[PDB]
Structure 1
């Protein structure tokens, strides 16, 4: 993994040593090169993982997440250079430094082979994100959003640290391979119940579980565009990766403890879709859609079958790409009219046709349209839930109907109708924005062409 880790730590000095007008060019080009290099991790095995060294290893679950992280960095650079034109050179370099640090922490998080090093990195991702939000956000509420995000995550994750050190004392090791090979059943006792709670609650807060989700609209609405892109596409997936990894040691207690979380996930999936139906803000609509999809992923992990894990992996990758694209589209609209209200700017199809096409494609992927990987993951989760019980189909069908309703509602409201008459500053779409949307959407369809690359280790 060092062939990918070191070039990022070299992005840092290159960013600080490049000229004042070449920072964006250098950062974008070399981020793309590092993404290309990280594409080599997809050549996985059918039996075991890629054990690079004592510290880092890669799997069919880690590799797509690393590729998504490395691919997301240059897109964030493009959106950032859109909205950070008037900044000073030092502050531009500080923003790029925060993005690079976040990418480095995420890479080491997905490739860390110990639960304690994984904990350290997955908690280290909080600082750059908090700085980005509370420093380069636009509105007053960025401070409160940062407080909510930070304290929700830490309240979730501190009992996880206690549980991890306890498990290390009990079993002698926190290495994932050793805890997989030496796993023992978790007896039904109050102590085991609270160990299970510590671990799962950390990752449920990070996911987020319905009822532990308010920090998500607060932070995703109030963050800058790069912050929104990384919060939804990658940072939400630390919870899924952690829950998939740590449930090795939590059986058979997961069979009995998953009822409250499954009930919360299914009902809150319905509730957040219904909220999306009646949102006066576009960014909040996209955030609540993210909550619904992560609820589906939580259901998949909790029911915990080989078909549900594949659907969970596929849905995580697909949601990352789709939500990042939706945030970028909303941000272009905001940079036009300087407001997040959904009904302020209308007729954007007759003012900007190609952006209307991008909106159509992003909203067609947001709802599960076959054969997109969004649908593939959702359908695998639905099938596993059907095997779990036969009323999960009722809840899942209701969720799919509401998802289609609010996605097409967003499309029709923003793009169709008649343009607002007094908004006379809708300049033609930039090549940069068009290329950003294309770079979001083409990999999704190529992943549809080759779907075994994102179905996880259980494939």
Structure 2
């Protein structure tokens, strides 16, 4: 994995030694090259993972996430180009450095082979995100958003550290291969219940879970465009990856402790979709849609069947791409009119046709239009939940109906209707924005063409 790790640590000095007007070009070009290099990790085996060394290993679950991160970095660079025109050279270089450090930490987190190193890096990702939000946010609430985000994550994750060190002392090693081969059943006692609670609650707060999710709207609304792109697409998937990794040692207690979280996740899907129905802010709508999709992924992981993990992985990848595209579109509309109110600007299909097309495609992918990988993952999760019980079908059906409702509602509100008369600063869409949307959308269709690459290790 050093062939991918080192080029990022070379992106840092290149960014700091490049000329003032070449930083964006160099960063984008070399990020694209690193993504191309990281595409080689998709050649996974069928039985065991790729064990590069004692420290780093790659699996069919880690590879798509690494590819997604390496692909997402240059798009964040383009968005930063968009919204950081008047910043000074040193501050622009600091912003690029924060993005590069976040990508490096995410890569090492996904490829870590031990739970303690995974925890260290997964907590190390907090610092760049907090700095980005609280430093380059546009409104007053960015400080409160950063505080909520940081303290929710830490309050979740500290008992995870205690549980991890306890597990190492009890068993001998935190290496994932060892804890998988040497796994033993977990008895139904209070101590085991609390260890299960520690680990699961940490990853659920990171996920997030319904009732532990206010930090997500707070941080995503107030973060800059790059921060919102990385928060929704990759940083939300750390909880899912951890749960898919940490549940190896929590059986059979997971069969008994999953009920409260399953009920919370399903009713949270319903509640967050209903909230999306009546949101006056576009970014809040996108954030709550992200919450609903992550709740569905939680349901899949908790029911924990071979058909549910494949759906979970596919839905994670698809939701990451779709949410990034939606946030980019919302940011373009915001930068045109300098306001996040959804009903402020209308007639955007009359004023900007190509952006209307991008909005249509993004909203169709959001509501899981077949044969998109969004629908593939959702359908696998629904089938597994149906096998689990026969009322989950009712809950999933109503959630799907409300999801389509609010997706088409935001599409019709923003794009269709009569344009606002007094808004006369709607300039034609930039080639940069069009290319950003195209680079967001084309990989989704290509993964639809080849879906076996994002179905996890249980394929």
Compute the TM-score of the two structures, normalised by the length of structure 2. 1.00
Please state how far the C-alpha of 1:453 moved relative to its aligned partner. Answer: 0.2
Deviation at 1:409, TM superposition (A): 0.1
Structure 2 SS opposite 1:78? helix
What secondary structure does 1:345 align onto? coil
Q: CA deviation at 1:204?
A: 0.1
Measured against aligned partners, the alpha-carbon deviations of 1:313-358 in whole angstroms (never above 9, x if no partner) come to 0000000000000000000000000000000000000000000000
RMSD in angstroms over aligned alpha carbons? 0.2
Aligned-residue offset at 1:102:
0.0
| Alpha-carbon distance in structure 2 between the residues aligned to 1:413 and 1:441 | 22
Question: 3-state SS of the aligned residue for 2:205?
Answer: helix
Other structure's SS at 1:382 match: helix
Alpha-carbon displacement from aligned partner over 1:233-285 (angstroms, at most 9, x marks no partner): 00000000000000000000000000000000000100000000000000000
SS in 1 for 2:50: coil
Post-superposition shift, 1:114?
0.2
CA distance in 2, matches of 1:269, 1:206: 17
* Residues 44-70 of structure 1 deviation map (CA, whole Å, 9 limit, x = unaligned): 000100000000000000000000000
Partners of 1:345 and 1:336 lie apart in 2 by: 10
Within-5 A mapping of 1:11-410: 11-410=11-410
C-alpha distance in structure 1 between counterparts of 2:368 and 2:77, whole Å: 29
Distance in 1 (CA, whole Å) between partners of 2:334 and 2:458 is 41
Which SS does the other structure have where 2:249 is aligned?
Answer: coil
* Cα distance in 2 between the residues matched to 1:268 and 1:439: 32
Partner SS, residue 258 of structure 1? helix
Corresponding residue SS for 2:113: coil
Query: In 1, Cα distance between the equivalents of 2:25 and 2:279?
Result: 38
Per-residue deviation, 1:289: 0.1
Runs of 4+ in 1 over 6 A off after TM superposition: none
* CA-CA distance at 1:387 after TM superposition: 0.1
1:213-252 CA distance string (max 9 Å, x none): 0000000000000000000000000000000000000000
- Is there any run of 5+ residues in structure 2 with no aligned partner, and where? none
Take 1:269 and 1:416, find their aligned partners in 2: how far apart are those partners? 27
Deviations 1:386-406 (A, max 9, x none): 000000000000000000000
2:57 match: secondary structure = coil
> How far apart, in 1, do the equivalents of 2:358 and 2:155 lie?
39
Question: How many angstroms apart in 1 are the aligned matches of 2:203 and 2:11?
Answer: 30
Structure 2 residue matching 1:44: 3-state secondary structure = coil
Cα distance per residue 1:113-142 (max 9 Å; x no partner): 000000000000000000000000000000
Question: How big is the shift at 1:410?
Answer: 0.3
Residue-by-residue CA offset, 1:66-106 (whole Å, 9 max, x unaligned): 00000000000000010000000000000000000000000
CA distance in 1, matches of 2:258, 2:341: 38
Q: State how many pairs are aligned.
A: 459
In structure 1, stretches of 5+ residues that fail to align are: none
Deviation for aligned residue 1:190: 0.0
